[PDB]
Write a protein that binds this ligand. Structure first.
Ligand SMILES: Nc1ncnc2c1ncn2[C@@H]1O[C@H](COP(=O)(O)OP(=O)(O)O)[C@@H](O)[C@H]1O
Ligand SMILES: Nc1ncnc2c1ncn2[C@@H]1O[C@H](COP(=O)(O)OP(=O)(O)O)[C@@H](O)[C@H]1O
Ligand SMILES: [Mg+2]
Ligand SMILES: [Mg+2]
Lengths: 222, 194
């Protein structure tokens, strides 16, 4: 079961190389954060206690060069354990068996190679254009806080032992590929965030520096 | 088992559908990129276009010799760049990049003249390749001609109307004029497509 994995993994490295502008992954994550915030905002207009777990409605992005991570946190509706498993799990899980079934299916169904490569640049899966691993921490009003992890081959989900630290919402943590180190650069992230947040109805911030000494804090990008 | 994995992927990549016509989209794309590099350069180097004053892409069909020519007056490539700039085959399988030409061609000949070198000819069948200084001298002025020796089954890409429709299809947003050598009611000249 090691050879199939070498073909699976390699197949992805080639398709990723077709994406010169991988920056779209950030547009997709912001779009999902926006959708989650709109959902809880809509709910709050009917239920006065819907925001009890976390009164703010924001998207906050932070870089961690030491750990080589990019965090995109929203205080949207969040996801229950089942949602992490059914929604993200089926989407991210493209291992040996999954990738082949989708291939033959695409083969039979008459799906163009173009239609295939395009699936790599849209939605949640687009995170893998720049990440070796994706970690999702989420808290939905109807469940406890959970952590989901995937390398695009397998995925696991376990209750967060830190308990409810998000209040409500989701953090998408990307363990970036070596060649995606550019997305750990403050100037690049601020530029891209500003680029894709022009239509979201909520404040988006990037953890940035400001200069008695250099202090870091949330900087409004839209 | 690298070659094995490579062979497997190649078999897989081609096990899916893809209109090989996308080769033209890729050639027009490359021509655009080359024209942009020299266009920009001309904004800082007053005489950069001295070798060839126009910024165009001209397509020619040679049914007789079974050849398709895509000539741009872009930046061109030096001898070193032809060897260097021209895995890649896998991407070509996906219908992307220079190597997508082999989807419709048995051999690709590239003639190029860069301001910093003499005109050269690069030839390949996707397995081996050769590069030699053009005996004809500087005939392009500046730029590149991609010459495709079309496969037997790709003979359809030599018909005027066919080529024209294809070019128009993949040149709408290109920042440069694309022409196709065509006849007019016993006249022949370049016809704009975008
Ligand atoms: N930040 C988030 N908060 C809540 N749910 C999310 C988030 N990101 C993704 N999801 C869930 O994952 C699902 C799939 O996301 P995606 O692949 O982008 O497809 P789409 O947005 O078209 O539904 C979303 O529909 C939603 O159910
Ligand atoms: N018409 C052309 N004029 C100058 N250079 C070209 C031309 N076509 C291809 N090249 C060179 O070949 C390289 C590889 O082309 P390609 O496989 O399409 O990849 P890409 O366009 O993404 O760089 C180009 O980057 C360029 O250096
Ligand atoms: Mg989405
Ligand atoms: Mg190209």
């Amino acid at each position: 079961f090691a050879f199939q994995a070498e073909v699976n993994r390699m197949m992805k490295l080639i398709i990723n190389s077709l994406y010169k502008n991988k920056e779209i992954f950030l547009r997709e994550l912001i779009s999902n954060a926006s959708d989650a915030l709109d959902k809880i905002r809509l709910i709050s207009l009917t239920d006065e206690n819907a925001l009890a777990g976390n009164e703010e409605l924001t998207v906050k992005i932070k870089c961690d060069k030491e750990k080589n991570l990019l965090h995109v946190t929203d205080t949207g509706v969040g996801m229950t354990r089942e949602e992490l498993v059914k929604n993200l799990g089926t989407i991210a899980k493209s291992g040996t068996s999954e990738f082949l079934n989708k291939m033959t299916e695409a083969q039979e169904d008459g799906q163009s190679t173009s239609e295939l490569i395009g699936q790599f640049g849209v939605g949640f899966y687009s995170a893998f254009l720049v990440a070796d691993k994706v970690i999702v921490t989420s808290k939905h009003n109807n469940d406890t806080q959970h952590i989901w992890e995937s390398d695009s081959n397998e995925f696991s989900v376990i209750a967060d032992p830190r308990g409810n630290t998000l209040g409500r919402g989701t953090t998408i943590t990307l363990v970036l590929k070596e060649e995606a180190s550019d997305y750990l650069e403050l100037d690049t992230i601020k530029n891209l965030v500003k680029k894709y947040s022009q239509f979201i109805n909520f404040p988006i911030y990037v953890w940035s520096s400001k200069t008695g000494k250099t202090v870091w804090d949330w900087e409004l990008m839209n």
